[PDB]
C-alpha cells in the first residue's frame, strides 16, 4: 500500500505517534517519506546482508526475522513480512521500541539527515487533523 501524506499522518496519529518519546507527528511522516516514499511494501538490501522492511525501513539485523541475515537478533519478535502489510500496526509497534533504543529517531539514518532540525510540521500542514 502506497499512502498519501495526509492519509499516513492520520493513521500515525490514530496509532499514537504524535509526541511519542518526544517526537511530534511531523517527524514520523518525514521519516516515512525519506525511508520508503510512503510505501508499506518497500524492501532494500543493505551491504551487510540485512534488509530494510516497510514504511519505516526496519532492519533485519536487529529487529525482525527474514531468515537470511546470519547473526540477526529479532528484537521486535516478528517475521520481517509482517512489516509489509497495508495496516501499519506492526511497523508502528516496532518503531515505538526502536525510538526507545539509545539513539532516538537517529536510528533512522534518513530522519537524521533529512528531517532532524527542519520544519517537520510542513509534513502535516494542510491535513485536516
Amino acid at each position: 500500500k502506497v499512502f498519501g501524506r495526509c492519509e499516513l499522518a492520520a493513521a500515525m496519529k490514530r496509532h499514537g505517534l504524535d509526541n511519542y518519546r518526544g517526537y511530534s507527528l511531523g517527524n514520523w511522516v518525514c521519516a516515512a517519506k525519506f525511508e520508503s516514499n510512503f510505501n508499506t511494501q518497500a524492501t532494500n538490501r543493505n551491504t551487510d546482508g540485512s534488509t530494510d522492511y516497510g514504511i519505516l525501513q526496519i532492519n533485519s539485523r536487529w529487529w525482525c526475522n527474514d531468515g537470511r541475515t546470519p547473526g540477526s537478533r529479532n528484537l521486535c519478535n516478528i517475521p520481517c513480512s509482517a512489516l509489509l502489510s497495508s495496516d501499519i500496526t506492526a511497523s508502528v509497534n516496532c518503531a515505538k521500541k526502536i525510538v526507545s533504543d539509545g539513539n532516538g529517531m537517529n536510528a533512522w539514518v534518513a530522519w537524521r539527515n533529512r528531517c532532524k532540525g527542519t520544519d517537520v510540521q510542513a509534513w502535516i500542514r494542510g491535513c485536516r487533523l
Partner: antibody
Amino acid sequence: QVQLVESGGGLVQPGGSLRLSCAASGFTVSSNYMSWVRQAPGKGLEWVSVIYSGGSTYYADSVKGRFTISRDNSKNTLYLQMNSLRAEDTAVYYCAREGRGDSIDYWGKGTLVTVSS
Amino acid sequence: QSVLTQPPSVSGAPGQRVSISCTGRSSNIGAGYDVHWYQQLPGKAPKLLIYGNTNRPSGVPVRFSGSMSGTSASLAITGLQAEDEADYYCQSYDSSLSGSVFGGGTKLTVLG
C-alpha cells in the same frame, strides 16, 4: 538578527558547580535543537550536549551524569548546569543552534570556564 | 574527535586544488550519517561551511565543495586563497556514541 549570548562563565574550584546561560533572540528555544560545544585553549571542538525540539537530551560520555542541559520558555534561554567540574572541563563553551541533521546554523561568541584551585 | 580523524595540517600554494580528508567508521560515515564542515578563523566562533556532505550555505564561495564515499568524507578547495587560512572541522553523528562527533581539526596553511 538571530542572536546567541553566553554568560555565567568564569573561575570555579574542582568539584565545584557552575551554570551557563544562553539568552537567545530571533527564535523560540523551545521549538529548536540547541547544543553546547566546547573548545579547550589551543585544542579542537568537542560536542558536549544537545536538547531536541521535543525535549530529548543527549550528552558526551565525558560529561554524562555531571552536566545537565535545559531551557526556560519564559526567558527564552538555554542552560548548561555543570557539576563536579574538573581541570579538563576548562574550555570556551559555545551555545549553538542546530539546523538540518545536527549541522550548526548559529554559534554564540563563547564564554570561558576555568576549573582551577 | 577520535571516531572521526583529520590530518592536523594541510599546506597549499595560491591557486592550488587541495583537499582535507575526514576518516570515519561504520558507526558514523559508514552508517550513512551525513558530514558537515566548519571553518574557524583566528579568535572567532566556527561557521558552517558545508552541510549534508555537499551543500553550501549562502555566503560560502563556490571554490568550497564537499564529497562523501564509504567511511570517509572530503572537503575540497579549488583555487586556494590566503583568506582560506583557518582551522577546518568535519562533523557527523555516531550511532555507537549516540550523539554528534567532530573530527580533530585541520590547520590549513597557504604558502606564498
